[PDB]
Amino acid sequence: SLPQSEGDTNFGDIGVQQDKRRGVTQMGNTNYITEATIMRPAEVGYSAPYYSFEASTQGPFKTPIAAGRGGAQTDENQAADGNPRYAFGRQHGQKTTTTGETPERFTYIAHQDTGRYPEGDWIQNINFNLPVTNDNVLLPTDPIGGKTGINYTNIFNTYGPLTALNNVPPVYPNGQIWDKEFDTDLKPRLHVNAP
């Protein structure tokens, strides 16, 4: 069913009951073929725990994120995607005739959409059965560990054998250009500081 009147408010329509469609799905116990349900080759981007500090022999440190920008800019969650922030001054970009020791800074937001919008996630019981019942859904709104400010998305990780992502983009003019590689037996697939 196609639109007969100009205007992006005049929508088209698939025109076939969701449970009577044809196609492939990775949900063996239902007949619903939805745009959120139908099968896709693999997965673009991944979910990582945010504002996570891990510890080892010399103290705590933040857990790095390699992510694009999945989410309409106005909305985002720069923590979830790990956007870099740069502080500098006088000799590297800040207005030359400025005074005082307060640096200049900016948070770089990439164009590539390989990020995530946590508030959009959710997990549900395999019986499916919609509309889902409160007891069969874990929302980025339900508390974890009793804490009112902690999600599951907060410690969630969806990296796996089907994960596809892109390298980091150049950042003019404060970005580093090249970088030495770690001398470990197994190397990282990328670095977050230089392309």
Place of tokens 């076939």: 16
Q: Which does 177 bind (CB under 5 to 8 A by kind): Ca ion, its own copies, none?
A: none
H or E stretch including 107?
Answer: strand 104-107
Q: Compute the distance between CA of residue 160 and CA of residue 26 in angstroms, rounded to an integer.
A: 16
Which of its own copies, Ca ion, none binds 123 (CB below 5-8 Å, type-dependent)? its own copies
Q: How far is the CB of 72 from Ca ion (least distance, A)?
A: 9
Cβ atoms < 10 Å from Cβ of 92: 12
Q: 17 near 3, Cβ under 8 Å?
A: no
CA Rg, the chain, in Å? Answer: 22
In 3D space, the residue among 145, 141, 150 whose CA is nearest the CA of residue 122 turns out to be: 141
Using CB under 5 A, which residues numbered 108 to 127 contact Ca ion? 113
Site for its own copies in 118-177 (CB under 8 A): 118-126, 128, 130-150, 152, 154-167, 169-174
86 binds, among its own copies, Ca ion, none (CB under 5 to 8 A by kind): its own copies
- Shortest distance, position 67 Cβ to its own copies, whole Å: 10
Interface with its own copies (CB under 8 A), residue total 170
The residues with which 10 forms a beta bridge, in sequence order, are none
> From the list its own copies, Ca ion, none, which binds 34 (C-beta under 5 to 8 Å, kind-based)?
its own copies
Return the residues of window 22-61 that contact its own copies according to CB under 8 A.
22-61
Least gap, CB of 31 to its own copies (angstroms): 7
Give which of Ca ion, its own copies, none residue 15 binds (C-beta under 5 to 8 Å, depending on kind): none
Give yes or no for residue 178 binding its own copies (CB under 8 A): no
CA dist., res. 70 & res. 111, Å (int): 9
Q: How far is the CB of 168 from its own copies (least distance, A)?
A: 9
Shortest gap between Cβ of 126 and its own copies (angstroms)?
4
Let me know the angle formed at the C-alpha of 118 by 140 and 127, rounded to the nearest 5 degrees: 55
Q: Which residue in 111, 131, 106 sits closest to 32, CA to CA?
A: 131
Binding stretches for Ca ion (CB under 5 A): 113
